[PDB]
Amino acid sequence: RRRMPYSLGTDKLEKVDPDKIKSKLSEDVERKLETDMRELYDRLLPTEAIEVNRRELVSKLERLFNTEWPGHDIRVHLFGSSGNLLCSDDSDVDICITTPWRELESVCMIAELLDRHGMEKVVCVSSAKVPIVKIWDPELKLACDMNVNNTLALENTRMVRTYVSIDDRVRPLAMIIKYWTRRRVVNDAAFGGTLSSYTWICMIIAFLQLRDPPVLPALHQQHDLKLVKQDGALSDFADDIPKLRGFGAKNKDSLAVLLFQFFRFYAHEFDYDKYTLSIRMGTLLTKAEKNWQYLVNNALCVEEPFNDGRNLGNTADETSFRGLHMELRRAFDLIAEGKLEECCEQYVF
Ligand SMILES: Nc1ccn([C@@H]2O[C@H](COP(=O)(O)CP(=O)(O)OP(=O)(O)O)[C@@H](O)[C@H]2O)c(=O)n1
Ligand SMILES: [Ca+2]
Numbered sequence: 075r076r077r078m079p080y081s082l083g084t085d086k087l088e089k090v091d092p093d094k095i096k097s098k099l100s101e102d103v104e105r106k107l108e109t110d111m112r113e114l115y116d117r118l119l120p121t122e123a124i125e126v127n128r129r130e131l132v133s134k135l136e137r138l139f140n141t142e143w144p145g146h147d148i149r150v151h152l153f154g155s156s157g158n159l160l161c162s163d164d165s166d167v168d169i170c171i172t173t174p175w176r177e178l179e180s181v182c183m184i185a186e187l188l189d190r191h192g193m194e195k196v197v198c199v200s201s202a203k204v205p206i207v208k209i210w211d212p213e214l215k216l217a218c219d220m221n222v223n224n225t226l227a228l229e230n231t232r233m234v235r236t237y238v239s240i241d242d243r244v245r246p247l248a249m250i251i252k253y254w255t256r257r258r259v260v261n262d263a264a265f266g267g268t269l270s271s272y273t274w275i276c277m278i279i280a281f282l283q284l285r286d287p288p289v290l291p292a293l294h295q296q297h298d299l300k301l302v303k304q305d306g307a308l309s310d311f312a313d314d315i316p317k318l319r320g321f322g323a324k325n326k327d328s329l330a331v332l333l334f335q336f337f338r339f340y341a342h343e344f345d346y347d348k349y350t351l352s353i354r355m356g357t358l359l360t361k362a363e364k365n366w367q368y369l370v371n372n373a374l375c376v377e378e379p380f381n382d383g384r385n386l387g388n389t390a391d392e393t394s395f396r397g398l399h400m401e402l403r404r405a406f407d408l409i410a411e412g413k414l415e416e417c418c419e420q421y422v423f
């Protein structure tokens with residue numbers, strides 16, 4: 075399922091003279107793009123029935139696990155887009171199973187139990203860095219990936235949820251960019267050699283942190299607004315939502331202007347060879363100061379904010395990155411003229 079064929083080669087795209095790159099939408103284009111984005115967002119928002127089903131899946135799993143293995147305080151939690159305000163009705167369900175009982179981290183035992191209780195397409199990856207069980211629930215009609223005790227993923231999901239809660243523009247902008255990535259088939263870091271949705275979300279956040287004035291702060295740096303978590307530890311990132319809300323309100327750019335600027339930033343402004351995007355810091359880092367010029371698959375460097383050693387761009391080789399950059403050029407060209415529908419056309423192999 076390789077998205078970017080090896081024929082593309084690996085050449086970097088040349089930087090275009092900044093004076094020759096459109097920097098502003100015309101009023102007519104902005105007005106129509108705003109309306110078209112708002113219509114698309116309304117269609118992408120989730121519906122009650124499916125949001126309820128996501129919760130029902132959590133409860134069903136928790137009951138099954140505590141009946142099979144009682145006395146181990148097994149709890150089940152949504153994460154990913156089901157927990158960060160960025161899901162649509164067709165989004166998969168990311169689930170984290172927490173327990174002090176480390177025996178449960180051998181996930182083949184979970185697969186066997188779920189197969190016994192009517193889940194379908196039950197498969198597992200026991201030797202991955204994060205072992206997972208995948209299922210299809212035929213009653214709730216949900217595809218689910220679950221892990222055991224990956225509490226970092228609960229926290230980075232909660233971080234994304236906090237960013238979404240800080241400024242009204244984040245949810246529609248991110249939901250629309252995510253839709254673009256699905257239609258263009260550039261959000262498949264396993265099969266396709268492109269980037270995970272989480273990676274794209276971090277890129278959206280990093281872009282918004284770099285607006286003038288910024289739309290989003292650097293939550294990991296706002297120490298005085300960190301609250302204590304349910305587990306009793308101080309949060310790694312600022313999370314006092316009432317005190318953070320409004321941070322970006324001084325930036326008055328519309329959703330249309332922000333979508334145009336997102337594609338302009340990634341298509342033309344950002345120097346991929348030199349810099350690492352860091353939502354932990356809210357400022358650009360250099361690859362060189364992280365020794366990231368040596369990483370395999372380092373054409374795009376997007377630092378995971380909880381593990382400064384993980385490049386979220388590491389699933390894109392140089393060929394795939396070339397194709398991704400070309401897709402960003404294409405999107406910039408089209409959004410510049412308000413062509414949202416064409417920008418989001420389904421890619422066909
Ligand atoms: N490198 C990574 C990749 C993923 N994760 C964790 O997995 C979740 C789902 O990834 P995801 O890519 O499915 C993001 P989501 O908003 O759910 O997208 P979707 O609606 O298109 O399904 C993220 O929210 C992170 O908690 C991580 O910790 N490190
Ligand atoms: Ca997901």
